[PDB]
Amino acid sequence: VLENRAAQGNITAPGGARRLTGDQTAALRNSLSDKPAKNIILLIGDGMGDSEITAARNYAEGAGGFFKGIDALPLTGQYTHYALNKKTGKPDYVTDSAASATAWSTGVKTYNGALGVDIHEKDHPTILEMAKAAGLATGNVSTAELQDATPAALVAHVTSRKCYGPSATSQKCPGNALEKGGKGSITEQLLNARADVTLGGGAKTFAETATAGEWQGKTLREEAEARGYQLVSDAASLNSVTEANQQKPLLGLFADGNMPVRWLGPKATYHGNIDKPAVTCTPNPQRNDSVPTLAQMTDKAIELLSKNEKGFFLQVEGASIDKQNHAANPCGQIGETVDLDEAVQRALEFAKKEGNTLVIVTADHAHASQIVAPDTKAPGLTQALNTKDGAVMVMSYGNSEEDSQEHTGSQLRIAAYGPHAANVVGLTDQTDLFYTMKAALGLK
């Protein structure tokens, strides 16, 4: 259970590339605690498989480097995340964000596209809904639009992830539409969920006015206000927030759609590793100084939430790792993995200081990006990059001919630190994660 995993010296010399100093047996033994967890922080890097972690590490820290947050969690294991075919109820080997998010927040497998409901479309309670009942403070932050599948799965029970607001739901999830007697669209269900801290993007859908209920005729943004929600939309305002609870809930909408990616770089191309020069990522010029970073929202959330004596549950998500992976854009993707590392460092720092906090870093499913040989002549999209090592790393994207690269089904890394983290070691399922949290928090 070591904190420093960088290569220890000259990597060309005997034992120069070792990440271990001594024997972990004792340190590890001392990391094993099955005492209760007062708090739980779940960081999800959407689409961040082992391939994604290695590429970003090579680039940003060098092959022999180590993410001070991401790679610093002592207990590790691999976990499966297959979905189910709605009709046959047989495994669908490649899940989407909705079906996977539903498994870790609910504990039951479901079809791709479902939020908070099993394949019979029967809804089950989420871990956020349960923490809220037990008395715990709750938080949900993401760099994606709030209506998106990963954050939404924590507060919504919809049969299709496309049922963002009033209009969308009417046609795509009519049985869910408030009018037809349903609980409502994703945005309305979020507004009803009423977690203490909810931060992200997706202000666009709050411009939709409801079609029924008390706030019918009034936009969803107005409803939020007419319900006690403190609305913040930039860095300075979030910062001013002094508190958030069931009387003063916090709702941050920092973007119309998704929040802006950290780095800019070009899209991979056919033979781009052999036709075009090596690229060096650069800060995204269009990201306004006032849009909060993932680490800042995570920081602010942990603060307000830590003011609760019963404890808290917080889910943080680095959404655009996945999205940029789909876009076949190495830089945006690596930049988003770097961003998330920052959030994890903030998470861990509090954890070691608090002592009863269980922190977990993982992903919902694997993705397309592959690290390959510099001289690789691939059928898909490639790009050469200038890593921190002063060397070149080529990235490959070859599982789709469409405009979007595809998710993949390989099992991936799950890492934890804190009381009950041993339940992450070995082979487990995406559903175990749910039970691990339910048990650590004593929400049973």
Place this chain on the structure above:
Amino acid sequence: VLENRAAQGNITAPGGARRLTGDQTAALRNSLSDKPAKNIILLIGDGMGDSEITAARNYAEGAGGFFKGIDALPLTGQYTHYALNKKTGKPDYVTDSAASATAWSTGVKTYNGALGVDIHEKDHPTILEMAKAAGLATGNVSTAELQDATPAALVAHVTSRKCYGPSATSQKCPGNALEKGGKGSITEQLLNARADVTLGGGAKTFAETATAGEWQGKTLREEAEARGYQLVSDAASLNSVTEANQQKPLLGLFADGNMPVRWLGPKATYHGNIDKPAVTCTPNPQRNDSVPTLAQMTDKAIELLSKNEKGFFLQVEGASIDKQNHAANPCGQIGETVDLDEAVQRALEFAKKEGNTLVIVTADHAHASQIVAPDTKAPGLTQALNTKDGAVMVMSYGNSEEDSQEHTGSQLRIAAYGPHAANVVGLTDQTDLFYTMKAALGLK
């Protein structure tokens, strides 16, 4: 620690997909032993990254299934395996078998192609040479030609993995050529090394004649015998062996080149998942019942080796997972993973019964194969397969336009069982493994 990680029951019902039956903490704390290990069995799945394990589990065992061998090692982590650029000494992100094998057996990074030497071409001892010197019995089994990089890295110090016999070394490694005062080719160095048990393929190279020294003029097979080596070429004759030591070492040559793969299936093709029907793998009609399985060689090796009270070191390799991966042949590739699983079961069973053995299952590097959606339209090679779940699974190979699929650089799974297994947890490096075995065996 759990020896049963298959889904609990109905994967479509809450808690049904779970693999955990309880809290791992105490079971996991009781597996953490830092007492010395008397023996070590290192099983390597060549090119078996996490992706290769999942695809083989979904096919052979079902998504919710579980490899009774591969998936049963309690302590897990992920490790980096980058090679070095010979010139600059900067990291080379995608390693070849020779430089990765050299790393775990030697503890020093090296360039791709190098067996047993650092970037300066300076020779460094391997873990087998150390075990042998300490008095421990040694074994080296694999399903590839014995001169291949994985087995070779343990007994040979060559500048190019191409220097198999006398004729290729003269021209390709003249500084190693016996005639030039060099230690000799790979085969000649294997014969000198003198491990107690050596099993695999690659007999054709033994037909070459030494160009200098004590056995100059005699083919390599003759030198083998002349030096007290017992030679066995089939299942039967292997079965009838009762001992193997420094007085009568064993040498199995079961194939001219590599041993034949277990399953037959078509090669993945362009748009193979949409244009060609789903496939069910079958037994390879070319494999003789005369040819022992990796499980059989493993078992026999453990029996003969286990007669040394002082200990033994053994390395097993399911070689063709890699080779079939390059060939874009899902069936051959999965058959080789199923086969390596039988070997890990033999290893594990012995280890639980002996109690002082450290068992480690990993791979040398990641490869091409990816698990993707059945409806996927990819630029590379694809194929649909009928799994045990009665569902279709599509596998994609898309990082090369040439006739061979490339390795990839993603960190991959490393798992262990036994004394000093806690050193496999978390993030580590391939070189760390060398040090982990040295200190477990007290080979210091």
